[PDB]
Symmetry: D2
Subunit: 116 residues, 4 copies
């Protein structure tokens, strides 16, 4: 019953991206970003436990993934400072979100799988 999960893959090595830091924010009434949650990806390239179904209310959310530090650790100079995923959550009721990020040094793709 985890409603927000993030999965990061490394397209160069073909493996999960481990130890990728990410920060999750929610848009405040004053249109600024308020810190919500944070963590680092597991050995499976995943991050769970960001929030509970109860705390995860309708809102605009941002997931910032520190892709630059990941590549620098591997000795590669990347293009992006980080990867941002910005989205409206739960506007039609509660959903479970899996955000996937696929990383290359000069390119990334992000996809959402949203289920009921």
């Amino acid at each position: 019953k985890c409603p927000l999960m993030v999965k990061v893959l490394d397209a160069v090595r073909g493996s999960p991206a481990i130890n990728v830091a990410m920060h999750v924010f929610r848009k405040a009434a004053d249109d600024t970003w308020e810190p919500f949650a944070s963590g680092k990806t597991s050995e499976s390239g995943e991050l769970h436990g960001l929030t509970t179904e109860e705390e995860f209310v309708e809102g605009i959310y941002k997931v910032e993934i520190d892709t630059k530090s990941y590549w620098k650790a591997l000795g590669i100079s990347p293009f992006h400072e980080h990867a941002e995923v910005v989205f409206t959550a739960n506007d039609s009721g509660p959903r479970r979100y899996t955000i996937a990020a696929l990383l290359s040094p000069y390119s990334y793709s992000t996809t959402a799988v949203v289920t009921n």
Copy 2:
């Protein structure tokens, strides 16, 4: 001659993404995002002439593509509010940057092609 251009494709239609609004910011000394340029893509899904070789100094830049408005205009309710590409530019000297975005309602990818003038 143009140091920063953006190309946007539509993965649903198999076509350039037309009339996609974009905003560019540059990070100021104070750590805030200062507006830097804007525009919309043409019939070829491209936006050129955002800045000049002389004005586009070293800095951290953000290109914000209003993908949500793009999809809504087509009657589609997509996942993302927008697509944002944040990068340091010109730190090892001047380069030409092409930012390419490929859009689907629930997914997008972005790639940079960076070449030495």
Copy 3:
């Protein structure tokens, strides 16, 4: 202990792609493709049980995914006849392979996560 798994996602709807047919082949001595396994994706957009670690020997493999029939079922005329993933398997010993395909009507991406 499943060594070859395929996961298909729909980038338009943001959901697993369910009931996508796929066929798996291995390159024969006579450089032709020999049928190996087949199936359709589950409600989770996944296909397992294609092979066992014992039967999955070093070889060149092809996974053909019938993306065209999937889109036609949804009333969309797609570009590709199907998506092909062609790769050498197990050349350095046994690995577990997860092949992911992300589908849009005029674009697809494929990624491999290979673990030990």
Copy 4:
């Protein structure tokens, strides 16, 4: 004037993919793949002049990009043998096709942009 072109980008380097070999086939009446055209990408990662508006009749075509040789030449051992794009062309009348491929060692994406002459 050119009805079929291919653009290949390198997602590791942030650059066009140069000297990528490609082979195109067309499905024959007998269900076999008959060789149709070939070439390599230029310095701009593009391959043009594969066929002519007149020769590129309705059919099922396959573009096979030798991504494995590309990566090996760079010292990298990638996952795929090649990238293959199989599609029906010109079934609703003549169109112009651009096949775009974005390459990483363990991932690639391919997109078609199809426009009406």
